[PDB]
Design a binder for this molecule. Structure first.
Ligand SMILES: Cn1cc(-c2onc(C(=O)O)c2CO)c2ccccc21
Length: 287
């Protein structure tokens, strides 16, 4: 905290010289791991980006469907957090042909919270399929029934609540909360730190009310840059509140070990430091 201020100032000195060096030191982390399963021909249509594939060692697996050996594949990865080896699932923005798989994963992994930090279309480019219902009428995604119960649209984010259940056991329904941050440009950062800090705190306070829940799903278009920055910020805000020492480098390092390119740009890495500095200054103001 008080140490982070001096540490950040050290990194920013000489036009971010040491910050850049530190970020460049991470470029190769985790990238010698294989992605052979994602490269199977029958999974080719299931990847939004050729260059963004999950590692075999950390990918999320769907239950196998008979007569299809590749029915277990989804472009998604487990990510550790501050308290669980599988605290998050990161994935790509679903395609029309994979959104049934996305909801199957949500159901099978006991997911109660989904975080989306991309718009479906940005600057005229499709980034994600509108994979949730457009109204309150329920519809099936594969063998799963989904129904949107509420939708609150604010200028910076939208929060929705879905009801999910299997067709065989309608009484075993589950509530899912969906947190959609809508003002985060691809490959960039939000216009203020305060905005994403408030969003992250909003999500975390909801996550903490679901202690028995499976991983929290976080996704953007690729499930890399904006997704990685959200998770890193979530982790370090928790560390700061728990009075522990913030470790931004370590959080991003750990992310990279589990999925390629997490926190995609140096500017996103800088933004993470600025968030911590801004929190400390708002708190040090009282002292
Ligand atoms: C093609 N491609 C797309 C991405 C990428 O990373 N994060 C995001 C996001 O959605 O925030 C995206 C989506 O553009 C990417 C990263 C490294 C190398 C290649 C890449």
């Amino acid at each position: 905290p008080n140490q982070f201020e001096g540490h950040f100032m050290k990194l920013q000195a000489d036009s971010n010289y040491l910050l850049s060096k530190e970020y460049e030191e991470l470029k190769d982390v985790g990238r010698n791991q294989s992605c052979d399963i994602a490269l199977l021909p029958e999974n080719r249509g299931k990847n939004r980006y050729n260059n963004i594939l999950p590692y075999d060692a950390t990918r999320v697996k769907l239950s196998n469907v008979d007569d299809d050996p590749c029915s277990d594949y989804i472009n998604a990865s487990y990510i550790p957090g501050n308290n669980f080896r599988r605290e998050y699932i990161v994935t790509q923005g679903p395609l029309p042909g994979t959104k049934d798989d996305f909801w199957k994963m949500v159901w099978e992994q006991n997911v109660h919270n989904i975080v989306m930090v991309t718009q479906c279309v940005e600057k005229g480019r499709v980034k994600c399929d509108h994979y949730w219902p457009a109204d309150q009428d329920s519809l099936y995604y594969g063998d799963l029934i989904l129904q949107m119960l509420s939708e609150s649209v604010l200028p910076e984010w939208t929060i929705r609540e879905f009801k999910i259940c299997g067709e065989e056991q309608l009484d075993a329904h589950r509530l899912i909360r969906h947190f959609h941050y809508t003002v985060w440009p691809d490959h960039g950062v939000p216009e203020t730190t305060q905005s994403l800090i408030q969003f992250v705190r909003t999500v975390r306070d909801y996550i903490n009310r679901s202690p028995g829940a499976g991983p929290t799903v976080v996704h953007c278009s690729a499930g890399v840059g904006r997704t990685g920055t959200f998770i890193a910020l979530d982790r370090i805000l928790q560390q700061l509140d728990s009075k522990d020492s913030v470790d931004i480098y370590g959080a991003v390092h750990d992310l990279r070990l589990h999925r390629v390119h997490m926190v995609q740009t140096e500017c996103q890495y800088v933004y993470l430091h600025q968030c911590v500095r801004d929190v400390l200054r708002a708190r040090k103001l009282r002292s």
